[PDB]
């Protein structure tokens, strides 16, 4: 039943993942409403989401970067506390939420590794000249404007990097 939606360099985007972010999310998962454009309209968006997810997974793989399960433990702790529900209780409720422990742990692992890879590969390529820091500090200071500069540069450079890596990464649609 589980077809292969698309191939990404060496990995794949199989149907189970694409659906998991379609049905268990997108009118489910959290704040059910979320987005109401239509599954058909957002199908390409979700497929590109999984594709870029897999591209960043491969990027992390090439660097030989591995995450210890201590980081996974802290990450799941953060995800449990942000929901205002404890860790073991959160697993107990996730059992009936439909995202099994295997699925949930894999999902959090992939999300955290993509976040880590994107942060590394975008932070280096953002250069903040030591003039616009003072320009913003005077506009409205003392490293507090550097945060806004980094936010704007990241919002832009992230999209640039996604476009670059989508272009530089074999993606073929098998469905």
């Amino acid at each position: 039943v589980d077809c292969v939606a698309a191939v990404v360099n060496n990995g794949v985007v199989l149907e189970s993942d694409v659906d998991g972010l379609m049905q268990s999310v997108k009118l489910n998962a959290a704040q059910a409403r979320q987005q109401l454009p239509d599954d058909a309209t957002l199908r390409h968006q979700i497929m590109e989401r999984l594709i870029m997810d897999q591209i960043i997974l491969q990027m992390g793989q090439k660097m030989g970067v591995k995450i210890s399960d201590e980081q996974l433990d802290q990450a799941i702790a953060n995800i449990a506390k942000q929901n205002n529900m404890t860790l073991d209780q959160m697993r107990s409720r996730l059992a009936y939420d439909g995202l099994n422990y295997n699925t949930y742990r894999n999902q959090i692992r992939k999300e955290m590794i993509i976040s880590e890879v994107r942060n590394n590969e975008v932070r280096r390529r953002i250069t903040i000249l030591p003039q616009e820091v003072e320009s913003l500090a005077q506009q409205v200071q003392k490293d507090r404007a550097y945060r806004m500069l980094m936010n704007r540069k990241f919002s832009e450079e992230a999209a640039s990097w996604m476009q670059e890596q989508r272009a530089s990464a074999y993606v073929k649609i098998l469905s």
Partner: protein, 369 residues
């Protein structure tokens, strides 16, 4: 021989010449830039046209009839074994009764417009390939070495230097900085438009405008070689293979971008941006979103020169000796002329009602619409 271009040069278009454009006058400057890719083009101050060849000869000519007013050779003859052409490449610039010329000897000559004697000569970081733009008592030159250097107009001493990243492989030529409100906006060969101050030379910002770095190939070229245009607080810059980006002058944030590239300057007049692509496709775009008002691919791959708005009519040379008057409302060829034989590489100069253009062989032509 067996080599043949990946792209065929577009055949010369056939046009209905609404007007009969003709060379008002023609004056030869020895040997011109030749086959070398230079920015060296004429200037025009009051009624006088300062043209140069890469050899070193600089002629001030009368802008009415084209007769030489003065002529000075910047080449320094060295006995009878070695001859040293000045290698003038930085387009002739004229602001303060001074003629500024960059040379690939890494020199900037400020001649006196009165007689052509060297007011000063400054050794600069690298080849002064760009136009020596003039602003706030400074002469700004973007050297091939990668440094944007500001010299003093009178002294000629390098006031300050800004090192801009230089890719391993780039495109011949450098962006001539544009000046707006005590700041210079220059285009780097690495695809970043950098705004710097005009007194201390510290970057206000450095916005990447290329974003088309294919990578794994040196031909991921992103040279911002067009002088950015600062209009209404908007910095329109154009990279090679890159994006025609309208940036914010104060912040350097991309207001918008279009996926078209060029290394030859573009006009940004009123509400219209006229440019000639790297493929020599004349486009007119909106100033507000980069929406293509019209396109003209009939000169494709003819190696057009930068356009100029001469009497409300884009004029583009090409590497055949042909000037094409393209309409600025729809893009139709209003006129066509053959002016030279060596071709046209440097930008035409439309000013004071005179449209001058120097051929690859050094001949400066005045044209009339």
């Amino acid at each position: 021989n067996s080599e043949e271009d990946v792209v065929k040069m577009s055949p010369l278009p056939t046009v209905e010449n609404q007007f009969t454009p003709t060379t008002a006058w023609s004056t030869s400057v020895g040997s011109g830039i030749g086959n070398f890719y230079s920015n060296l083009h004429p200037a025009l101050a009051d009624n006088v046209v300062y043209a140069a060849d890469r050899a070193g000869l600089v002629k001030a000519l009368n802008a009415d009839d084209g007769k030489e007013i003065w002529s000075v050779s910047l080449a320094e003859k060295d006995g009878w074994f070695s001859k040293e052409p000045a290698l003038l490449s930085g387009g002739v610039t004229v602001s303060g009764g001074h003629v500024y010329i960059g040379s690939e000897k890494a020199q900037v000559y400020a001649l006196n417009t009165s007689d052509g004697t060297v007011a000063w000569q400054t050794k600069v970081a690298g080849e002064a390939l760009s136009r020596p733009v003039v602003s706030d008592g400074l002469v700004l030159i973007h050297t091939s070495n990668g440094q944007l250097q500001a010299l003093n107009e009178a002294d000629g001493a390098v006031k300050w230097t800004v090192n801009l990243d230089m890719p391993s492989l780039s495109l011949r030529g450098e962006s001539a900085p544009t000046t707006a409100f005590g700041a210079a906006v220059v285009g780097g060969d690495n695809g970043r438009v950098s705004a710097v101050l005009m007194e201390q030379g510290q970057m206000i910002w450095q916005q990447r405008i290329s974003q088309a770095t294919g990578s794994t190939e040196i031909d991921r070229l992103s040279d911002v070689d067009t002088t950015p245009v600062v209009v209404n607080g908007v910095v329109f810059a154009l990279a090679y293979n890159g994006n025609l980006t309208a940036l914010d002058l104060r912040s350097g944030q991309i207001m918008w971008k279009r996926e078209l590239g060029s290394v030859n300057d573009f006009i940004v007049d009123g509400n219209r941006i006229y440019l000639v692509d790297q493929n020599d496709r004349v486009m007119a775009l909106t100033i507000d979103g980069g929406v293509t008002l019209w396109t003209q691919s009939d000169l494709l791959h003819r190696l057009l020169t930068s356009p100029v708005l001469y009497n409300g009519n884009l004029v583009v040379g090409d590497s055949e000796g042909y000037l094409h008057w393209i309409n600025v409302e729809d893009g139709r060829f209003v006129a066509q002329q053959k002016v030279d034989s060596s071709g046209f590489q440097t930008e035409p100069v439309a000013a004071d009602g005179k449209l001058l253009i120097q051929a690859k062989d050094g001949t400066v032509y005045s044209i009339t619409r």
